[PDB]
Symmetry: C6
Subunit: 159 residues, 6 copies
C-alpha cells in the first residue's frame, strides 16, 4: 500500500505537464519545467521559480470493511529571485500552484503492481492547509511554505 513516492511523482508530473509553455491565461508562471522531488533542500537549484515537493508524515484510520483512509501531507516550497519583486512574484507563484492543485480534477496516479504493469487510479481529495512565507533574512532569495494534505484509498482490502 502507501504508494507515497507515487503521490509525489504524480503531483510533480501533473504540475509540469499543466505549466509547461501552454495556456497562458489562468496560469502565469511560464515554467519551461523545473519541478521535481529528487533534488531539494537548497543546495543545487541553480535555476529559479523552482518548486520542490517534500514528503512528510501521514496518518491512517481503519474502517471495518477493509477500506483504508490515509491522510498524507506534502510540504511544498517555492524559491524566487527579484525578477520584478520578491513578495509580488512569490504570491504570483503560490497563486499559480494553488490554482493548478485545485481547479483541475483529481490526480492521475501511477501505482506499480508487483512484477506486473501500472494500474492507473485516482486520489480522493485535496485540502490545502496553512501557507507560510519567508522572513526578511536572505533578501536576494525567497521561500514559500505550503502545507497540502492528500487522502487516498489504496487499491486493497483487509481480510
Amino acid at each position: 500500500m502507501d504508494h507515497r513516492t507515487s503521490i509525489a511523482q504524480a503531483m510533480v508530473d501533473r504540475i509540469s505537464k499543466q505549466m509547461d509553455g501552454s495556456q497562458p491565461d489562468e496560469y502565469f508562471n511560464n515554467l519551461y519545467g523545473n519541478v521535481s522531488r529528487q533534488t531539494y533542500k537548497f543546495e543545487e537549484i541553480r535555476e529559479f521559480p523552482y518548486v520542490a515537493v517534500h514528503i512528510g508524515t501521514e496518518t491512517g484510520q481503519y474502517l471495518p470493511s477493509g477500506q483504508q483512509w490515509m491522510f498524507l501531507e506534502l510540504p511544498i516550497l517555492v524559491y524566487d529571485k527579484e525578477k520584478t519583486d520578491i513578495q509580488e512574484q512569490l504570491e504570483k507563484l503560490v497563486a499559480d500552484i494553488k490554482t493548478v492543485i485545485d481547479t483541475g480534477g483529481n490526480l492521475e496516479y501511477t501505482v506499480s503492481k508487483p512484477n506486473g504493469s501500472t494500474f492507473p487510479c485516482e486520489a480522493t481529495d485535496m485540502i490545502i492547509t496553512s501557507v507560510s512565507t519567508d522572513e526578511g533574512l536572505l533578501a536576494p532569495y525567497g521561500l514559500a511554505e505550503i502545507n497540502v494534505t492528500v487522502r487516498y484509498q489504496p487499491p486493497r482490502r483487509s481480510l
Copy 2:
C-alpha cells in the same frame, strides 16, 4: 488567487492616502508617506513614526459550495522615536492605525488576472486581535506589535475548468 500581497499593498495604500496631510480631525500623524511592505526589518528606516506591514501565515477551510474561507494574518509593526514621549505618541499612532483600519469602510483590491487587467474585488471582513508593546530596552526607540486578521473570499476558481 490568494491576493495576499495585493491585500497588503491595497491596505498600505489606503493607510498612506488616508493619513497624509488631510482631515486632521480624528486623524493626526501627517505622514508625508512612509508605510510600505517593501522595506522593513530595522536596517534602513532613517525616517520614523514608520509603521510597517509584514506578511504572515494563512489558514484555510472548505465550504461545500465551491467557496473557500481563508484567514490572512498581517502582523504589522510600529516604530517610533522619543519625541515628547514614546508611550503617548506610540499609543496615539496605533490608535490612528486602528481607527483607519476600522472606521473607514472596507478594503479595496487591485488584483491582477493572469496576463490581463486589474479587476477590483473586495475583502469580506477584518478583525484586529491582540496588540502588544515593547519593553524598556532601546529607550529612544520603541516597538508596538499589533496583529490583524483578514477574512477574504478568493475568486471561486472552481466550476470553471
Copy 3:
C-alpha cells in the same frame, strides 16, 4: 481606541492621590509619591516602597453593533527594603494597592481627542488575577507581581 497609556497614567494618578499622606485609616503607606510609568525596570529607583505599572498584552473581541470590548493587562511590581520585614511590608503594600484597585469606584480617565480637548470618560470593570512574589534571592530588596485586567469600551463605534 487603544488609548492605553491613558489607562496607565489614570491608574498611576488614582493611586497617587488616593494613597498620598491622607486618610491614615484604610490606607497606610504614606507614599509622598513615587508611582509612575515612565521609569521602571530596576536600574535607577533610589527610592523604595516604589510601585511601578507595566504595559502588557491586550485582547479585543467584536460585538455586532459597533461595540468594542478590549481586554487589557497591566502587570504591577512593588520594590521594598527592610523597614520591619520584607514579607510583612511587601504584603501590606500589595494589600493597599489591591484595596485602591477594588474599593473605590471606576477610573477617572483622561482620554485625548485628536486636535481637541480631553473628554473625561470611564472604565467599566477591573479583575485582579494571580498575585506572585519573588524568591529568596536578592535579600535586601523584594518583588511582588500583580496581574490586573482593565475592561473598557473605547468611545467610538464602527460603520
Copy 4:
C-alpha cells in the same frame, strides 16, 4: 486584605505550638522549635528536622455579592539528616505535618487592621495537593516538597467606601 503573610505566620505558630514537647501520642518529631518563614532557602539552617513554609503564587475569582474567593499556595519543604533512615523519618515528619494540617480545628489569624488592633479571623478550608519527595543525590540530606492550598474569604472591603 490578602492576609497571606498572616496566614503563613499563624500556620507556623500553630505548628510550633502543636509540635513542641507536648502530646507525645499522635505526634512524633519533638520540635523544640525550629519552623519559621523568616530564614529559609538552604543556607544557614544549622538545625534539622527543619520544615520551612514558602509563600507563593495565588489565584482569585469574583462573585457577584462583593465576596472574593482567594486560592493561596503555600509550598512546604522539609529537611532531614540520616539518624537511622532518610525515608522512614521523612515519612514520619510529613505524616505529622499532614495530621497537624488536617485533624486540628481550623486556621486562626492575627491580621492587623489599618493603624489599629488585631481582630482574629479564620480560614474557610484547607486542601493539600501533591507531596513530592527528593531523589538520592545529597545522600545525608533530603527534601520532600508539600504543596498545600487554602481558601480564605478576605474581609469584604467593598460596599463601605
Copy 5:
C-alpha cells in the same frame, strides 16, 4: 497519613517473600533477594536481576465524610546482565513483577503508630500503567521502566 516509605517497604517485602527460592513455576526468577529501596540510582548493584523501587509523586482527593484517597506512584526499575538475551530476560523479569503485583490479593501492610505498636492494614488497589524499555545504548546492561499506582485510605478521618 502519607505512609509512603511503608508502602515501599511493604512492596519490597512482598516481592522478597514471593520470589525467593520457592513457588517456582508461578513466576520465573530464582531471585534469592535483591529488591530494596535504600540502595538505587545505578551505582552499587554488583549483582544483577536487581529490581529497584522508587518513591514518587502522589496526589490526594478529599471526600466529604472524613474519607481520604491518595493516588500514589511507585516507579520500578529492573536491571539484567544477559546470560541469554537482553529483551528475552527483560520481558521475563517484567512478566514476573507484573504477576507478583497482580495475582495475589491486596498488600499486607506494616504502618507504625505513634510511640506504639504496628497496626497491620490494607491497601485498596493497584493499577500498573505504561511500561517502558531502554535504548540500545548500554548493551551489556539493561533497563525497563515500570509505572504503578497504589490506592490507599490512611487509617484516619478529619474533624
Copy 6:
C-alpha cells in the same frame, strides 16, 4: 503476561518466513534472511533492505472482569541503500511491510510458560498509525519510521491464585 519480546520475535519470524524467495507475485523484496530484534541502532547492519523491529513504551487499562487490555507499540525503522532510487525502493519496502501488517492473517505467539512448554496464542488486532521517513541528509542511505500498535489480551492470571 507482557509477551513483548515474544510478540516481536513472532512478528519478525513471520516477516522473514514470508519475504524469502517465495510468492513473487504481490510480494517482492526477496529478503534472503536478515531482519531481527537482536541487532539494531545503525552500527553493524552491513546488509541493507534491512528493517528493524524495536520495542517501545506500552499502555494499559483494566476492565472489571479480570481481562487486561495492553496497548503495545513497536517502532519500526527501514534502512535502504541506493539501487535504482532511494524513494522508490523505500516506498516499496514500506508498502511490503504494511501489507504484511494488514493482508496476512493474525499474529501468532510462541510464549513459554514458567519453567514449562510453549503453548501458542494469538494477538487480537493490529493498527498501524503514523509512519514517517527521513530527509535529504545521508543521501546514499535512508530512513523510514513505522509506528505499529498491537492490542493483545494477556492470559488472565487472576481468579486462579
